[PDB]
Design an enzyme around this catalytic site. Structure first.
Site, PDB file in Angstrom:
ATOM      1  N   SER A 145     -73.222 -65.680  38.149  1.00 49.41           N
ATOM      2  CA  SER A 145     -72.090 -64.894  37.651  1.00 49.41           C
ATOM      3  C   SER A 145     -70.823 -65.740  37.709  1.00 49.41           C
ATOM      4  CB  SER A 145     -71.979 -63.552  38.369  1.00 49.41           C
ATOM      5  OG  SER A 145     -73.222 -62.861  38.298  1.00 49.41           O
ATOM      6  N   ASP A 243     -76.667 -60.000  28.593  1.00 50.16           N
ATOM      7  CA  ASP A 243     -76.132 -59.878  29.939  1.00 50.16           C
ATOM      8  C   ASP A 243     -75.261 -58.636  30.075  1.00 50.16           C
ATOM      9  OD1 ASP A 243     -73.774 -60.705  31.890  1.00 50.16           O
ATOM     10  OD2 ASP A 243     -75.601 -61.756  32.509  1.00 50.16           O
ATOM     11  N   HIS A 288     -78.309 -57.480  34.720  1.00 51.64           N
ATOM     12  CA  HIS A 288     -77.367 -58.208  35.565  1.00 51.64           C
ATOM     13  C   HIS A 288     -78.057 -58.894  36.738  1.00 51.64           C
ATOM     14  CE1 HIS A 288     -77.349 -54.157  37.579  1.00 51.64           C
ATOM     15  NE2 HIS A 288     -77.556 -54.946  38.618  1.00 51.64           N
TER      16      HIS A 288
HETATM   17  O1  LIG Z   1     -69.110 -62.185  39.009  1.00 49.47           O
HETATM   18  C1  LIG Z   1     -69.331 -61.733  37.934  1.00 49.47           C
HETATM   19  N1  LIG Z   1     -70.317 -60.797  37.548  1.00 49.47           N
HETATM   20  N2  LIG Z   1     -70.227 -60.635  36.165  1.00 49.47           N
HETATM   21  C2  LIG Z   1     -69.128 -61.499  35.672  1.00 49.47           C
HETATM   22  C3  LIG Z   1     -68.568 -61.761  34.427  1.00 49.47           C
HETATM   23  C4  LIG Z   1     -67.510 -62.659  34.323  1.00 49.47           C
HETATM   24  C5  LIG Z   1     -67.045 -63.282  35.515  1.00 49.47           C
HETATM   25  S1  LIG Z   1     -65.691 -64.455  35.565  1.00 49.47           S
HETATM   26  C6  LIG Z   1     -65.577 -65.129  33.885  1.00 49.47           C
HETATM   27  C7  LIG Z   1     -66.151 -66.364  33.604  1.00 49.47           C
HETATM   28  C8  LIG Z   1     -66.049 -66.872  32.324  1.00 49.47           C
HETATM   29  C9  LIG Z   1     -65.393 -66.160  31.332  1.00 49.47           C
HETATM   30  C10 LIG Z   1     -64.833 -64.920  31.600  1.00 49.47           C
HETATM   31  O2  LIG Z   1     -64.164 -64.204  30.586  1.00 49.47           O
HETATM   32  C11 LIG Z   1     -64.965 -63.331  29.838  1.00 49.47           C
HETATM   33  F1  LIG Z   1     -65.280 -62.236  30.579  1.00 49.47           F
HETATM   34  F2  LIG Z   1     -66.138 -63.939  29.510  1.00 49.47           F
HETATM   35  F3  LIG Z   1     -64.260 -62.957  28.730  1.00 49.47           F
HETATM   36  C12 LIG Z   1     -64.929 -64.416  32.890  1.00 49.47           C
HETATM   37  N3  LIG Z   1     -67.596 -63.024  36.682  1.00 49.47           N
HETATM   38  N4  LIG Z   1     -68.621 -62.135  36.758  1.00 49.47           N
END
Ligand SMILES: O=c1[nH]nc2ccc(Sc3cccc(OC(F)(F)F)c3)nn12
Length: 343
Positions: A145, A243, A288
């Site tokens: 994640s 996802d 997830h």
């Molecule tokens: O820890 C958990 N569980 N699910 C998740 C989903 C995203 C994140 S951080 C992240 C990383 C890259 C892109 C982002 O921007 C988006 F959302 F892609 F637009 C956010 N962390 N995360």
């Protein structure tokens, strides 16, 4: 089975200034080291981080961490649970910086919180060298994640610091699980939050990616398909085609045509971004679930499990291998069209 060590450099801290740390189970007969980055989203401003401090405090502080944790999935030492690396030295790095592992900023008069994720990884590596990592042949930086994105942001920096510290024989590799997202249009209506987070954290991205996108545009490097081509270390990408966190940021929750087309297009786009990723495992599932779950062995793509694919990847890093594939991306277009998807 993994024992907590708080960082000896107590200025490398979680959000609230408590020391960061790592959980370690050594395997003295092994030259393989697995360093796993925990996930758990992030926080991007004072008020958002204050809320997280109230009800997600273990993700911002070590004050309440337990003395031990059990290794599960790829962190398990049982051969039956972990066919891939059960005999490795196991390290679990708790996520307590709320910065997708990108930060390099201390608390100060002007900063309520410290965002030191990138420095935490470097300090864990430094302190592990004195505990046997100096004898490693492979250091696999893995994560799920936010931790999977963290792998993409940090694997080359770990490779660079080991070179600069005088350990050029340690092969650094990455395993990014569930950290490969698309900056796509939402189904109903993010990148602005990452953009603001980076400024709040003094977040750092890999140098070649930073140089492509240039000042103000570092957020691009949080997206796997944009940062991956810039990386030099070998990186294996694990990503469900559907996802649940991707669907959440897309505002997707009896499916009519508009949503059917949206979901099908998402799977095709994800599959497209992985076409030139030679080490990848991307099942057509709505999930997830992550690689530290005990039943991580069950899912298969084209008849090959992830522990097998990872083993084949190890062999490839010694021409494709007979019967031992490393690029495993489902082509069927709807969640759970793969019968082995988790229930
Ligand atoms: O820890 C958990 N569980 N699910 C998740 C989903 C995203 C994140 S951080 C992240 C990383 C890259 C892109 C982002 O921007 C988006 F959302 F892609 F637009 C956010 N962390 N995360």
């Amino acid at each position: 089975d993994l024992r907590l060590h708080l960082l000896l450099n107590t200025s490398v801290t979680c959000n609230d200034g408590s020391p960061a740390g790592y959980y370690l189970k050594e395997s003295r007969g092994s030259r393989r080291w697995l360093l796993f980055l925990e996930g758990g989203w992030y926080c991007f401003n004072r008020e958002n981080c204050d809320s997280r401090y109230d009800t997600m405090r273990r993700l911002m502080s070590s004050r309440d961490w337990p003395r031990t944790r059990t290794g599960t999935g790829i962190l398990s030492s049982q051969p039956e649970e972990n066919p891939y690396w059960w005999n490795a030295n196991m390290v679990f790095i708790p996520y307590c910086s709320s910065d997708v592992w990108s930060g390099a900023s201390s608390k100060s008069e002007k900063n309520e919180y410290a965002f030191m994720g990138a420095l935490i990884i470097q300090e864990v590596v430094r302190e592990l060298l004195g505990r046997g990592l100096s004898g490693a042949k492979v250091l696999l930086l893995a994560g799920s994640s936010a931790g999977g994105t963290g792998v993409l942001l940090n694997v080359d920096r770990v490779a660079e610091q080991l070179e600069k510290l005088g350990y050029p024989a340690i092969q650094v590799r990455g395993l990014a699980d569930s950290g490969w997202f698309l900056d796509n249009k939402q189904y109903r209506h993010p990148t602005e939050a990452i953009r603001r987070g980076i400024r709040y954290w003094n977040g750092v991205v890999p140098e070649r990616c930073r140089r492509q996108f240039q000042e103000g545009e570092e957020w691009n490097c949080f997206f796997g398909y944009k940062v991956y081509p810039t990386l030099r270390s070998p990186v294996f990408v694990v990503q469900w085609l559907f996802d649940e966190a991707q669907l959440t940021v897309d505002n997707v929750h009896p499916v009519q045509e508009g949503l059917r087309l949206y979901i099908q297009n998402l799977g095709r786009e994800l599959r497209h971004t992985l076409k030139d990723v030679p080490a990848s495992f991307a099942p057509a599932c709505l999930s997830h679930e992550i690689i530290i779950r005990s039943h991580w062995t069950d899912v298969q793509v084209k008849g090959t499990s992830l522990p097998r694919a990872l083993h084949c990847w190890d062999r490839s890093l010694h021409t494709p291998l007979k019967g031992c594939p490393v690029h495993l991306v489902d082509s069927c277009p709807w969640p759970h069209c793969n019968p082995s998807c988790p229930t």
